């Protein structure tokens, strides 16, 4: 409980209409702390939205994945601020495997790459700068830093 259900539902109803570009998350195992790009096909009921993924595909690998998601797992695309230089300890998102995955900066930028660690995979690697962003949370219609 660090978001308010009433407000979140209202804001989601307001902003996520047909055609709206969004990010959606999943409760499925191994997908905690990941945001996928998508677009609202249409709202469903009062709490849900049919979305079509920008990058994720159906099993043939060709047709865009389509799924229902609820108002607690959908958000707008965050502002990108690319004036940013990452510092060690910064909570970030890194784009790979078709998604924005939560990670932590473990080494400052060198030669256009940043050292990154992912807690989910317990894996460490260097990422190209333009595949990284500062992590932000969508709360009650407002973008906030951690």
Numbering used by the authors: 206 to 351
Question: What does the literature reporting this entry say, word for word?
Answer:
Here, we identify a previously uncharacterized H3K9me2-binding protein, which was named AGD-containing protein 1 (AGDP1). Our biochemical and structural studies reveal the molecular basis for the specific recognition of the dual marks H3K4me0 and H3K9me2 by the three tandem AGD cassettes of AGDP1. Our studies identify an H3K9me2-binding protein that regulates heterochromatic DNA methylation and reveal the molecular basis for the specific recognition of H3K9me2 mark, thus establishing an additional linkage between H3K9me2 and heterochromatic DNA methylation.
We also performed structural studies on AGD34 and AGD56 of AtAGDP1. We obtained the free-form structure of AtAGDP1 AGD34. The overall structure of AtAGDP1 AGD34 resembles that of RsAGDP1 AGD12 with all the peptide-binding residues, especially the H3K4me0- and H3K9me2-binding residues, conserved and occupying the same positions. The structure-based sequence alignment of AtAGDP1 and RsAGDP1 tandem AGD cassettes indicates that most of the peptide-interacting residues, especially the H3K4- and H3K9me2-binding residues, are conserved. Intriguingly, all three tandem AGD cassettes (AGD12, AGD34, and AGD56) can specifically bind to the methylated H3K9 mark with preference on H3K9me2, suggesting that a single AGDP1 protein has multiple H3K9me2-binding sites. In contrast, the AtAGD34 and AtAGD56 binds to H3K9me2 about twofold higher than H3K9me1, although the peptide-binding regions are quite conserved. Our in vitro binding data suggest that a single AGDP1 protein possesses three H3K9me2-binding sites and sequence alignment results indicate that the AGD12, AGD34, and AGD56 can each capture an H3K9me2 mark using the same mechanism.
